[PDB]
Design a protein around this ligand. Structure first.
Ligand SMILES: Nc1ncnc2c1ncn2[C@@H]1O[C@H](COP(=O)(O)OP(=O)(O)NP(=O)(O)O)[C@@H](O)[C@H]1O
Ligand SMILES: Nc1nc2c(ncn2[C@@H]2O[C@H](COP(=O)(O)OP(=O)(O)O)[C@@H](O)[C@H]2O)c(=O)[nH]1
Lengths: 114, 822, 104
């Protein structure tokens, strides 16, 4: 929800380093989707972000594989008015890796890796 | 690679190679290249001669054998190839450019580089190579010639002329370099000789300056202006010679405009006024020093103009002190009565003529130079237009000049005409200033004596005056007077300095610098004050004192020293950061003034000692020790300056904050500590080779350092830095560090390289939104530069430096703002 | 060894630097403020200057790069703060003047 809204790229990058400190796959997958996925040309551009290693559970969701708040918003603005296709690019370059062997095992990624 | 010799069958079964490049390898001979080559790059190899195997490839297209020990070049009738397009032979021991056998075989040749070689003379068969684009014969220093046949190489757009003797030396340089081919072509058309030079009579305050001129041409008020005349000399050696005489004004009131009329191609006379013997010779020394500072290569023939009185051995001081001490080349001297003719006056005529015929700067004999006949026809036209235009307004409109040249059938188009009128202003026929800051692009003063009598007429608190009295061209008067350093007038302005006090006197917070010279040049102080108004400036004749605060001010005085005949120039500034900024701006202004107006000073004793002062004890400094600026600059490796013992020291930024790069805003300090960088390995040099661009890790981040070679100047570097210091746009390559030891530059590193390589190699990445983001970022940079009131003048995919390929990024494209630096 | 009595008397006699024989030519001064609204001017028109006027004035006015001359001071702290106790003369006016310029 916060990333679909306007978030600065420096903020998302710093928070990516934070969330890679306490490594949790789903959140850093969402951050990488906001940062380094270019769906228009089947492009992952995971470049200058200096991440230590890479887990296949991270970039896993990058591969293609309730109207509650809206009705609340519509009611309250009414009251406000009344009161008024594979992806073939994978680029992992400037991230200072030390062993790419984590991607080597048969994870949930290899069909995309082929 | 450290290969010595290739195998004889090394490319035996590879019959499709094209670009076999073996650069900086210890190679000696080419063993049987295949016949399918196009380009070879065999430069920096231990070659002794062009090997015969390369002379038989029937499809060779380029050849790089620069920096090789080769002597003889085979002529164009041995190459056996009909598509040669780029022969590069820089830095070789080649002597002859023999193009005489069959020169038409090289008609398709585009580039040709014979720089840095022992070439003797360019052969005149060069004119058939109709497709030359960049002929490089620079850095030879033994050529001193150009055949008139090379005016046919119209496709040439650039022609390097660095460090080589010249013949025309017409002050037009190869910055255009196609006009040079136009002049060579027009000289190939007609090639008429030329016989005209200037004779500037120089003296002071009443001497044989006009009467001597009245007797010399075999023909009384004091001079006002410079009183341009001329007289021909029919030399019987049948040489029709005319030379115009410029008897300069004598009184010191006109001494702030004579540098506008002292050129290097003239013969000067210096007049004694020998009535007051042995002192007027001593009084003549500022004139000789000014001649030396203005025209370093022009001879001066002295004349004593009172043989009616005696003090007879006044030539003793001339033979002792006036020979060679920083004074110009005194070729002769005489003594005359200068009222009626004599054997002395007759031999004065003969020596003046004989010294005129043998001027020969750089052994070129300027008295008999060669020009196209279009120049002489324009000269006759303009000299007839002087009588055709009345004395009320001899200024000539540019369109009127075009109508005059269209009134006749001269081959002068609008292209060569600026150099035409520049050369005619050089020989003193019509004065015209092509400076676009002046409104003289349509003002061409025929009969320049009118201009000199008018513009000097005005000189006939204490010194200021506003507009107070010309047919509605008064703003031309005012703009010319500003151009002539007349406007308030800097001359006749309150010679008495005031008794100024300063808020800072503790002799540690005051930076002082001296600029010791023997005399002040003629129009020095007017040019300095005019170029220094860029702040209650309470100035006088020889000072400024513009003041912003006790914390920020300046004082460009003129101190005089006890028991010192040499003059001085004392720059006082406080020692805060703003003081260093002001000092740097002032020093750069002064150096630019001397380089642009008096080159005779800054040439080899060097005639101008830039000093520096420093105190050891703060307060009661006891005559701050003078230190020359040159070896203080040479003490750059030691950033502190100390006495004979290290019990004290002073940082160089304390007493010379221009050498140490601190006068500019301190964000671009070099800071050599965290610079993980090695200029040696070419791994990092892969970030660019045409400029010395490398890759380095600095302050933890990755940078793209640029090492400056010896083609730059420190003052020019500082000029480049100050404009590059404060741009700071997100589509601009920002700077991170700059300084000395070595002269380097730390700019940001573009990851994906330039744009041209991307569209050349990886054209699948441009995807209709990356294209648009690149275009938008470049347009943002251009709009910022235009809002920076500067031009770029070279925009190309060679300069669009990319940072990422993600389309929805913050920054993608950045431009190289070093193009504004050159 | 009574030289400090000499100097103290000379200061008392308005001799001390000497205010007399001090650079009668005024310099060509410019001012940073000239828009004729931010400048307060006042005149002190008198028929002649009294004998020891300017020495007594300059001595009692040093209480700031004071670039003075015989008939002025111009002590300056800033474009925002300065003073100029000149002596202006007027066209077609025999009476002398004393022109105090200060920013507003
Ligand atoms: N800061 C930089 N980051 C990345 N690449 C750079 C940088 N500066 C230069 N380059 C590259 O290196 C090349 C050579 O640099 P440069 O000094 O500009 O030579 P040039 O552009 O060909 N013109 P010149 O300086 O006269 O040789 C450029 O064309 C770029 O491709
Ligand atoms: N009687 C005499 N007069 C001389 C001699 N040499 C110069 N003069 C005088 O010098 C004057 C010319 O001054 P000049 O230098 O030409 O004027 P300026 O160039 O404007 O300074 C004339 O009045 C001459 O009488 C000389 O040998 N004898």
């Amino acid at each position: 929800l916060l990333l679909n809204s306007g978030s600065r790229e420096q903020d998302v990058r710093k928070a990516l380093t934070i969330s890679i400190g306490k490594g949790d796959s789903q959140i850093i997958s969402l951050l990488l989707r906001r940062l380094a996925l270019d769906v228009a040309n089947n492009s992952i551009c995971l470049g200058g972000f200096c991440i230590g290693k890479v887990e296949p559970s991270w970039l896993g969701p990058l591969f293609p594989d309730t109207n509650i708040a809206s009705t609340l918003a519509r009611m309250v603005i009414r009251y406000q008015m009344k009161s008024a296709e594979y992806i073939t690019s994978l680029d992992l370059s400037a991230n200072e890796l030390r062993d790419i062997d984590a991607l080597s095992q048969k994870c949930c990624i290899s069909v995309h890796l082929e | 690679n450290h290969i010595s010799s290739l195998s004889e069958n090394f490319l035996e079964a590879c019959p499709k190679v094209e670009s076999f490049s073996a650069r900086m390898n210890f190679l000696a001979a080419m063993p049987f290249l295949p016949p399918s080559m196009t380009i070879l790059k065999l430069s920096q190899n231990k070659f002794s001669c062009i090997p015969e195997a390369i002379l038989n490839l029937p499809h060779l297209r380029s050849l790089d054998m620069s920096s090789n020990d080769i002597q003889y070049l085979p002529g164009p009738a041995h190459w056996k190839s009909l598509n040669l397009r780029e022969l590069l032979f820089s830095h070789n021991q080649i002597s002859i450019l023999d193009l005489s056998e069959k020169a038409y075989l090289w008609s398709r040749v585009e580039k040709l580089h014979l720089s840095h070689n022992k070439l003797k003379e360019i052969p005149p068969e060069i004119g058939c190579l109709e497709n030359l684009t960049s002929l490089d014969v620079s850095y030879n220093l033994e050529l001193r010639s150009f055949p008139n046949e090379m005016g046919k190489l119209s496709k040439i757009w650039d022609l390097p002329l660095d460090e080589l003797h010249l013949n025309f030396d017409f002050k037009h340089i190869g910055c255009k370099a196609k006009d040079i081919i136009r002049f060579l072509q027009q000289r190939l058309k007609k090639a008429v000789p030329y016989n005209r030079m200037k004779l500037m009579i120089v003296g002071n305050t009443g001497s044989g300056k006009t009467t001597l001129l009245q007797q010399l041409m075999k023909t009384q008020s004091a001079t006002v202006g410079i009183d341009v005349k001329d007289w021909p000399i029919q030399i019987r050696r049948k040489r029709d010679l005319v030379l115009n005489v410029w008897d300069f004004a004598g009184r010191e009131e006109f001494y702030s405009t004579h540098p506008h009329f002292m050129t290097q191609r003239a013969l000067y006379l210096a007049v004694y006024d020998l009535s007051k013997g042995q002192a007027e010779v001593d009084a003549m020394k500022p004139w000789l020093f000014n001649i030396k500072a203005r025209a370093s290569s022009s001879p001066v023939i002295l004349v004593g103009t009172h043989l009616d009185v005696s003090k007879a051995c006044m030539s003793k001081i001339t033979k002792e002190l006036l020979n060679k001490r920083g004074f110009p080349a005194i070729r002769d001297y005489h003594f005359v009565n200068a009222t009626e003719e004599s054997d002395a006056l007759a031999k004065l005529r003969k020596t003046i003529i004989n010294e005129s015929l043998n001027f020969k700067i750089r052994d070129q004999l300027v008295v008999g130079q060669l020009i196209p006949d279009c120049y002489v026809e324009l000269e006759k036209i303009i000299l007839s237009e002087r009588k055709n235009v009345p004395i009320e307004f001899p200024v000539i409109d540019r369109k009127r000049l075009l109508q005059l040249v269209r009134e006749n059938q001269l081959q002068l188009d609008e292209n060569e005409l600026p150099h035409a009128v520049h050369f005619l202003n050089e020989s003193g026929v019509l004065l015209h200033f092509q400076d676009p800051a002046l409104q003289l692009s349509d003002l061409y003063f025929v009969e320049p004596k009118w201009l000199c009598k008018i513009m000097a007429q005005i000189l006939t608190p204490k010194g200021i005056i506003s507009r107070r009295d010309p047919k509605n061209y008064m703003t031309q008067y005012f703009k010319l007077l500003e151009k002539f350093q007349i406007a308030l007038v800097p001359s006749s302005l309150s010679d008495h300095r005031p008794v100024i006090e300063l808020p800072h006197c503790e002799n540690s917070e005051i930076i002082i610098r001296l600029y010791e010279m023997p005399y002040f040049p003629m129009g020095f102080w007017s040019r300095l004050i005019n170029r220094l108004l860029e702040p209650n400036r309470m100035y006088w004749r020889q000072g400024i004192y513009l003041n912003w605060s006790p914390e920020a001010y300046c004082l460009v005085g003129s101190e005089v020293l006890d028991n010192h005949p040499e003059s001085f120039l004392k720059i006082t500034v406080p020692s805060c950061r703003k003081g260093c900024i002001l000092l740097g701006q002032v020093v750069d202004h002064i150096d630019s003034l001397m380089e642009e107006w008096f080159p005779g000073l800054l040439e080899i004793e060097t005639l101008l000692k830039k000093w520096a002062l420093y105190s050891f004890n703060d307060g009661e400094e006891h005559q701050k020790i003078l230190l020359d600026d040159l070896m203080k600059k040479a003490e750059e490796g030691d950033l502190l300056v100390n006495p004979d013992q290290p019990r004290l020291t002073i940082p160089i930024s304390q007493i010379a904050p221009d050498l140490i790069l601190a006068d500019l805003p301190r964000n671009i300090m070099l800071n050599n500590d965290e610079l993980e960088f090695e200029q040696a390995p070419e791994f990092l040099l892969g970030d660019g080779s045409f400029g010395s661009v490398y890759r380095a890790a600095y302050e933890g981040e990755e940078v793209a350092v640029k090492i400056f070679n010896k083609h730059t100047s420190l003052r020019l570097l500082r000029q480049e830095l100050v404009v590059l210091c404060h741009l700071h746009h997100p589509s601009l390559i920002s700077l991170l560090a700059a300084g000395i030891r070595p002269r380097m530059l730390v700019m940001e590193l573009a990851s994906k390289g330039s744009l041209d390589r991307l569209l050349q190699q990886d054209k699948a990445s441009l995807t209709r939104t990356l294209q648009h983001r690149i275009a938008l970022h470049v347009a943002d940079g251009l709009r910022y530069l235009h809002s920076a009131m500067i031009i770029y003048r070279d925009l190309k995919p060679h300069n669009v430096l990319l940072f990422t390929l993600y389309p929805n990024a913050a920054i993608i494209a950045k431009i190289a703002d070093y193009g504004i630096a050159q």
